[PDB]
Homo-oligomer: A and B are copies of this chain.
Amino acid sequence: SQQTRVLQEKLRKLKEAMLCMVCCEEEINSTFCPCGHTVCCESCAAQLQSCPVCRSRVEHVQHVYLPTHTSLL
């Protein structure tokens, strides 16, 4: 029905919000510290000297284990 399409769109937008804001390909699993923006995968986060959301300097990157994480398994 039309509601199937609406639900597919909601699911797609939620899954998109879980992907890296830089590469759009890998899951978010890293936090820029100390600002706390958690918007990148580990590969993009390692390459950024400033947070891409707030431009605060990145002192270090904290890996985050989230309950929503998925994998080929």
Contacts and interface: CB of A to CB of B under 8 A. Distances in A.
Interface of A: 1, 3-4, 7-8, 10-11, 14, 17-18, 21, 28, 31, 33-39, 53, 62-68
A66 B4 CA distance: 27
A37 B35 CA distance: 18
Nearest to A37: B65
Given A31-B31, A33-B62, A62-B62, A68 B18 contact: yes
Contacts of A10: 11
Nearest to A39: B67
A1 to B, nearest CB: 6
A21 B7 CA distance: 25
